[PDB]
Amino acid sequence: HSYSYEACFWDPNDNGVNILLGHISQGIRSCDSMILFFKQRSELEKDYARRLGAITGKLDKDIGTNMDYGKLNETFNVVLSVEKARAQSHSKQSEILFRQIYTDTKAFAANLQARYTTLSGKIERLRMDKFNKKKGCEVLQKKLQDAQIRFRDLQLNENNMIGAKRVEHNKRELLKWESNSQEYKVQLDVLKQEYKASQKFWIHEWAQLSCELQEMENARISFLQSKLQQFATSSMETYILEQTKMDMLTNHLNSFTAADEISTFSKENGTGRLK
Amino acid sequence: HSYSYEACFWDPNDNGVNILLGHISQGIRSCDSMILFFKQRSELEKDYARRLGAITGKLDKDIGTNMDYGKLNETFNVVLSVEKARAQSHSKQSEILFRQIYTDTKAFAANLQARYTTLSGKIERLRMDKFNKKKGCEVLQKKLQDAQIRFRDLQLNENNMIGAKRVEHNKRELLKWESNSQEYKVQLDVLKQEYKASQKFWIHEWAQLSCELQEMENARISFLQSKLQQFATSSMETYILEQTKMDMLTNHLNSFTAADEISTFSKENGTGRLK
Structure with a gap:
């Protein structure tokens, strides 16, 4: 039941190993998707803020040069102030993106990669130890069977020996391969x-180590999860600020009428009535 | 009391005229402040949308290339869809700016200028008629006084005439300038x-025509007033849309935990437990 990395990946050919190592590794490269996005998005907001500021710059000089009257002039300045507020807001947003979330995500990804590289090395080294030792057993099992066969052949051959030199030579071979069979058997038991x-x-x-992996992925998911809310x-x-500023502009566009502008202007600059 | 353009600008030297003509004229050039702003702002949003789209483009290919698992992959696609929604929203905003408010404001401003030019011509022509006619009166008043003086001189001179040719010559001059005085007087009364x-x-x-001016300015204020709300x-x-999309992203970032991703992955790809 209960499902995790250390619980569910036990295969007699270490299949679950490469599956987990593959998953964590692909998840690390998958970070580059967001790392690049965060960077480009950051660079985008900076240019937006900078170019908007340049636009409000020409607007400021134009308001001053091309002077205007009363409320319609005070409304031109609200537009001016609202827009430079957005500019500053996008600029501040840009800086948060480049350093707090882009930089910290790239740095964290490089560190995951470093740990993963170390883990994979430790893994490979360990399961090779099972491989080499298993191969070693089979190798010696061949040697043992060979030695046992050459021993049985020599003792079956013992009766066909004629000379004293021929007899002795075969008796020597007999014990030599008796010895070999005995030692190989022991060398095999220990290696077993x-x-x-x-x-x-x-x-x-x-x-x-599967827990170490499960901790890696968990730290990867959670980190990206938190970084995306911060985003x-x-x-x-x-967006909430930009709404409030357009509320301001709306609230004051509705605060006056063109009839008001004509009334007040005539009050201030009238040159006398007619009688 | 009650204040307007046709009520309060009556001066015996037509001062209020040039004040109003000056005000309407400066208000027309003042439109260029917003006309240029609308244009540049429009051009800004187009580049923002286009460059954001290019960014979500690289994000899409990266998600597909660098594959990712479960909820963290479905969250990468929410980010992708949220951002291309903003792109389309800024793009649509850009088009509204260039044609419905920039184009219609520039066109309207050019039409105000056309009417103003015609009005000012009609004004100048009319008050010149008062000038020329006033100058004409003063000119003839000089001529009348001159003729009256030369008449009185000639009749005072009548007794100093010796010859018959000298007498006749003076009697001729007398009636000539009697005639001149009489005609000039009549020519002056009519010109008066x-x-x-x-x-x-x-x-x-x-x-x-002061009402025509007051209608011009009123149409100028109101038009800019409505165009700025449309803005x-x-x-x-x-901004209201962008908020809703970040609500989506927030709502789903909080819909899962890293523990969920580990549980499900082990369920789908586990290679067997340990006994």
Whole structure:
């Protein structure tokens, strides 16, 4: 039941190993998708703020040069102030993007990669120890069977020996391969136990290293998860601000009528009535 | 009391005329402040949308190339869809700016200028008629006084004439300048009445043309007033949309945990447990 990395990936050919190593590795490269996005998005907002500022710059000089009257002039300045507020807001948003979320995400991704590289090396080294030791057993099992066969051949041959030199030579070969069979058997028993020990050590280790992997991915998901809200919050703050500023502009466009402008202007600059 | 253009600008030197003509004229050039702003702002949003689209383009290819798993992959696509929605929203905002408010404001400003030019010509032509006629009166008043003086001189001279040719010559001059004095007096009386008529016509006309001016400015204020809400509304629609999209992103970032991703992945791709 209960599902995790250390619980569900036990295969007799270490399949679950490469599946997990593959998954964590592809997840690391997958960060480059957001890392690049954060960067380009950051660079975009900077240019937007800078170019908007340049636009409000020409607007400021134009308001001063081309003077205007009363409320319609005070409304031209609200537009001016509203827009430079957005500019500053996008500019501030740009800086948050480049350093707090882009830089910290790129840096964190490089660190995941470093840990992953170390882990994979430790993994490969360990399961090779099972491989080499298993190959070693089979190799010696061949040698043991060979030696046992050459021994049985020599003792079956013992009766066909004629000379004293021929007899002695065969008796020597007999004990030589009696010795070989005995030593190979012992060399095989010990190498067998070394292998079962190595099998036991892998189980001990993989129980731990799969947890290290599960901690890696968990730290990867959660970090990206938090960084994306920090993204969605920083952006949110701008949009909520931009709404408030357009509320201002709306609120004052509705605060006066053209009839008011004519009334007041005539009050200030009238040159006398007619009688 | 009650204050307007046709009520409060009656001066005996037509001062209020040039004040109003100056005000309307400067208000026309003042439109160029917003006309240029609308244009540059429009051009800005187009580049923002186009460059954002290019950014979401690289994000799309990266998501597909660098594949990712479960919720963190479905969250990468929400970011992708949210951002291309903003792009379309800024793009639509850009088009509204260039044609419905920039184009219609520039066109309207050019038409105000055309009407103003015609009005000013009609004004100048009329008050010159008062000037020329007034100058004409003073000119002839000089001629009348001159003729009257030369007549009185000649009749005072009548007794100093010796010869018959000298007497006759002076009697001729007497009647010639008697005639001149009489005609000049009549020519002056009629030109006086032409002037008082022209004074009356100006009052009749200026009562109307000051209203034409007051209608011009009123149409100028109101048009810019409505165009600035259309501005503040089109922009508002974007900011309100952008907020809703970041709500989406927030709502789904909080819909899952990293523990969920590990649980499900192990369910789908587990290679067996340990016994």
